[model samples]
Target: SNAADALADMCARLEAGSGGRLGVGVLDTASGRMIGHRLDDRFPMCSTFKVLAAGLVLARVDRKQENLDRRVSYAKSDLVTYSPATEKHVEDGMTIAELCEAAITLSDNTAANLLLASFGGPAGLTAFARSLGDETTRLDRIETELNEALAGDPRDTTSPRAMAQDLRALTLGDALSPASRAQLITWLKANTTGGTRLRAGVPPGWTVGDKTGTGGRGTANDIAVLWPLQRAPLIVTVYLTGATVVRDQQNKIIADVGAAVAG
Candidate 1:
């Protein structure tokens, strides 16, 4: 009880430190204990939806409607700003598995767009989320456009609670087949992007499978499934909005809040 209170207080302090708003959600996979601050507040998803996109791909694979090894070809015209991964592979095309990794492990916008197009676009991802019992998460646009973070616009948004639970379902719940589930987790654990985000905040000795997102108007996010040594995992989602601080400061706020609930 005291620790929970401490977590609440720490979140408050970190949010204040941001000079804006901080949203956090944590789920104990073992006991289903969930706690949050601004958990229901919608925030621009940015690239965080990459994980969800990967999820729908895995779900399709699970249902035998898709194949991970199938090659997906694209042209330079398909590339958008900040598409290092997909651009590197545009010449020979990349398989579904490669695209998923690029999107999740490398935050490849070009790869995400290709994957979304093959999987039915934002509408398909939203429909998949709704099928999984999520009432608040929505992906109404593609990358670049989806990362708009426009004030008062609700498109391409997800609450911390919704994203956290969705992460739980996809990672630890029954959202994918055994093989596909393992594959997604493998990619998450292998993510190359790092910051003073979830990984920095989580205590040492814990392995974190996480994805980070950045957007306009000072929006930053990190969603992760963290495994404490020798125990069940914890799913944590932290979204920072309207932060007036520098990027590093915003990252520290996210890390600090993540460190709090990780205890």
Candidate 2:
């Protein structure tokens, strides 16, 4: 009861303090306890689609339609903006495993574009999300173009509860094979982009794997699956949009939300 009140208070402050339309979803995978503040609201997905991109590749690998060992080589023209990993590996092709890792952990735009080409662009990602029972999520554009997060436009947006359910299906449910699940989780855990977002709020003993997305118009998001040492895992998702704040404040908002839910 106290915790519920605490979450409400925090939600109130965040909405007023940041002047952002906030969306939060916390799901207890074991018991199906859900708590939220406007969890069904829309927010731009940004680079977070890399999570789904990598997962779909692993899904293909599990079904024997593709192999991680396969390598891809592309010209510099294929490289798009914000491609750190793929830029360095331009001369030498990256294997599928490496591409997934780069896309998720590094937010390598070129790697994401390559993965999109392999999987069928935004449409491919949306279908996979639908396959996992997420109806409120959509990925309509590719890399740099997708980051155009204008207000009231729902093109590349996802609802917090909608994305949380997708994470629950992928991480705790049977939507993925054991190898693919662990690999995807590992990439998320190794993500260098979190920058003290969701990880700051989880208990010290718990394990957390988080993916972050930043977009235009003061949009920022973090989605994570957290595991307690004892029993069940929890999903924490925070999406804030239309705020006129600095990046540091945005990250702190997400951390506070995670603390309120996971603590």
Candidate 3:
């Protein structure tokens, strides 16, 4: 089958496996071939927005506008409901890089908010992404204000294709210096938030530099660049919304996409 046909098959399988809307975009870096299902439709990004937030902050760090080594204090009031790392420390301060690690590695809400504020807030993040040529992605709220029910309110939502493009740009060092891009990739590769999504589908000897996001309303999303041993890297973005299926099923959908593309 042709590349388009292969992508179509992947999308069909993912859609059939889930009761929700599935948006997927796969880019074969070697040939620049692209294909997907509902690639233009926006979905709630949830914690996945951290990718952009962190990138923006890192860009400022690269420009010498922010200091990664400087420490910031966290108060008890700074804690959010699902914070995994930052909630444990009250009145204790950590460096910017450490907070970024907590945000990505542990999906700590408080850490994310701290970084977001330091980088200037939702407007700054949105502008950063837009400057990178991502017009469809927008982050309007912090983690605390995330209302899953109001899915269309521009509350940290992005389309599969838009994110895939952004990932491609990041990998290519467009709008970001090599050092900045490398720093961001390091954090993404270290992400330990969701194991069963894109990571589960990766074949042996291959690696994935990616980020995962989840929402209260069964939103499961994973965006990653897959580095296989024998071929060029592939940028894959998989998003599931209104997913009433089991968590395993949701993860399998993303894993299947990776397996199909890796072949």
Best model number under lDDT: 1
lDDT of 2 by residue, 1-263 (tens): 56656786788788788877888888887779778888788899888888888888988999998899999999999999989899988899999999999998888999999998998889999999999888988999998899888989999889988888888877777788988888888898898988678888666777888889888888888998888888688888888888788888988988888788866
lDDT for 60 in candidate 2 is 93
Better of 2 and 3 by lDDT: 2
Residue 233, model 2: lDDT of 86
Model 3 bad stretches (over 4 Å): 147-153
Error of 2 at 234 (Å): 0.6
**Per-residue lDDT tens digits of candidate 1, residues 1-263?**
67667777888888886877788888888889888788899998999999999999999988888999999989989999989889888789999989999999989999999999987899999998998789999999997899888876899999999999999988888888888878889999998885568898888889989999999888999999999988888999999888888998888888887778766
In the range 190-223, model 3's lDDT, one tens digit per residue, is 8887688878877868888888877766688899
Name the top TM-score candidate.
1
- How many angstroms is residue 247 displaced in model 3 relative to the true structure, after the best TM-score fit? 2.0
After aligning candidate 3 to the native by TM-score, how far in Å is the CA of 226 from where it should be?
Answer: 1.2
Query: Stretches of candidate 1 above 4 Å error?
Result: none
Query: On a 0 to 1 TM-score scale, where does candidate 3 land against the true structure?
Result: 0.93
Reference-based lDDT, residue 153, model 2: 98
lDDT of the structure predicted as candidate 1: 0.88
Candidates' C-alpha lDDT:
0.88, 0.86, 0.81
Worst lDDT 10-window in candidate 1: 1-10
Model 1 vs truth, CA RMSD: 1.2
